[PDB]
Design a binder for this molecule. Sequence first.
Ligand SMILES: Nc1ncnc2c1ncn2[C@@H]1O[C@H](COP(=O)(O)O)[C@@H](OP(=O)(O)O)[C@H]1O
Length: 534
Amino acid sequence: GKALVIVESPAKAKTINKYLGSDYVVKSSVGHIRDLPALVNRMGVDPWHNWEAHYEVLPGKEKVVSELKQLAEKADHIYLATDLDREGEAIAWHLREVIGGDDARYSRVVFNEITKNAIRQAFNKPGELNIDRVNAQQARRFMDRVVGYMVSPLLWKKIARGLSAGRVQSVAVRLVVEREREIKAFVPEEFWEVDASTTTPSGEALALQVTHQNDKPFRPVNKEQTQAAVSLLEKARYSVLEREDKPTTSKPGAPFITSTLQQAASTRLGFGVKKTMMMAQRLYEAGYITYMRTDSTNLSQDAVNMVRGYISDNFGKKYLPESPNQYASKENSQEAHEAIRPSDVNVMAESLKDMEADAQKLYQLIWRQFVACQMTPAKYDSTTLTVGAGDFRLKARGRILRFDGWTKVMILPAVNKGDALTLVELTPAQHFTKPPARFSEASLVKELEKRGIGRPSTYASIISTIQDRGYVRVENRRFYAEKMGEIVTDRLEENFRELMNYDFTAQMENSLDQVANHEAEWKAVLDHFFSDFT
Ligand SMILES: Nc1ncnc2c1ncn2[C@@H]1O[C@H](COP(=O)(O)O)[C@@H](OP(=O)(O)O)[C@H]1O
């Protein structure tokens, strides 16, 4: 009968409750409490009557709503403590609209971390439900509903029952299909490379690749031109034309954001996209990391000071940059203002108490990326040898690590300019250009991000769905378009070319953000969407 705080999961309720006093009753409403269900009747949304929607409490959740009602009235003030993004904003909105009461009866608290300071400042300066966000979510919802209920039927008719088209997953399948057709159509190009094994004045071995002939790039295309070059190279005199020594540096990557976390988690840990977000959310809800749906590589000042503090103690001076390493500002298309990082750098992956082995591995990846992004660059001594042999130009590259810098948390022989090199053996080799590489789970996420097709909340879903529906399959960690995906794609491009257009999809995603950021109105965006779509 004090103050009621609503969160979306038991796990989140147990953690936030640690930072809320006696006058706070924390209750969770597992996921979506309310949602969408002739053609308009089934969709639960009317594109022909200014997007009139018909929401209804989820099947069976009729109890939860009541448990909340008689608990809310029994409450002083109601705090909507859902995740910070527009999705959590709509869940908050649905809760307020179902429990009822006056608006001044609710507050929307915002935090991107479940810690003592974060929850304090969140309940200290509570805000109001942001209607633009809610409308952005609704608009995305209505767009997906319209596409699915109006396109899936054509797939049932022209191909098979059980098939379903998605506004974004459809374009994602096209990306894999095109790549499949690009690969099958690829015609290998023959080309040769000549290498030269040589000896330094002191004896040390040195391998060189022929790069230029008569000051033009060396690219023989057949056995005949190669044999000619080899014959000249056999009788030429080899001498070092140049030894370029330059200090090179390697900078650490930026702290993670949703897409980069999925890419690295897949490549470095073999974790599937859905698994990463599941472990990530587990970590976030237990208060170990910052919100996991973000496209901001920005880091708060406190987090930066703390990890720099950690870097001094555990690595020393030479690893601590002069000034902090900045990557991006807090402003981005999405709601999250910070990157994915640990809530406390002092907490190692090995100390997490209620986490499975995989959630620990992920935290470990998140932790190391975060600490490394504030460490100094790795320093290398690069060596480029340019060798002359008659009319030919040869080169050899070398590199030796001087300072590991950030890599701590994760060679050519000697010869001077003018030195003579003894030709030991020439190795002419025939090769064939390779087809475009196939998509990996990591390169597909990157592709989706690069084209503006995906968002932090859809990357995973988009990649999981297309595999489940059977349009693509993964084999040996690489993506293969399935015949069914190719067939659905061609039919979709015939009947709905606009839907299958990359720029259309990316525009709609941008338009959604615009609604969220008060730069566009949702019904107008939906009107333009439905208009392009039909
Ligand atoms: N550059 C422009 N200047 C003025 N009107 C435009 C316009 N582009 C589109 N419209 C109009 O805006 C409405 C929505 O179209 P669209 O979705 O393509 O933007 C259309 O009219 P109606 O609403 O009367 O049909 C269309 O003719």
